[PDB]
Structure 1
Amino acid sequence: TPVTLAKVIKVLGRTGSRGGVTQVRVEFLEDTSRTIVRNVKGPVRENDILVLMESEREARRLR
């Protein structure tokens, strides 16, 4: 299981039909000049750290 940790730098907004998932822009701790968007269900605030198995799979808005 690949392990990489990053930190959210921008919460975009709520997402999904039911409104449970959320798009957040997250900047990686290593090689910090890269911000990717992820989908998260639980609450997230600023300067919070996520752990993700995959690195480059841009999760888009879930209509």
Structure 2
Amino acid sequence: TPVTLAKVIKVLGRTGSRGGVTQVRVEFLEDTSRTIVRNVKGPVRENDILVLMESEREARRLR
């Protein structure tokens, strides 16, 4: 099982069905310079390392 820890670097607006999600763009420390777009859940700020269970994945606005 390949675990990835990506540190947040930019925010692109908070989405959410009820308004509890954000369109966040991160960049894992594992071979930096590669910024993959994903989504977060709770309180987020740039420079926060995530615990996403995937390397290649991406979703748009949540409704």
Give the TM-score range, shorter chain: 0.7 to 0.9
| Higher percent of residues as strand | 1
Give aligned-pair identity as a percent. Answer: 100
Question: What's the CA shift for 1:16?
Answer: 2.2
TM norm structure 2: 0.84
Gaps of 5+ in 1: none
Higher mean C-alpha displacement, 30-39 vs 48-57:
30-39
- State whether residues 37 and 60 of structure 1, in contact with CA within 8 Å, keep that contact through their aligned partners in structure 2: no
Partner of 2:52: 52
Question: What's the CA shift for 1:12?
Answer: 1.1
Question: What's the CA shift for 1:6?
Answer: 1.0
TM norm structure 1: 0.84
Q: What are the superposed Cα offsets for residues 20-55 of structure 1, whole Å, 9 maximum, x if unpaired? A: 111111011012121112211201112111011111
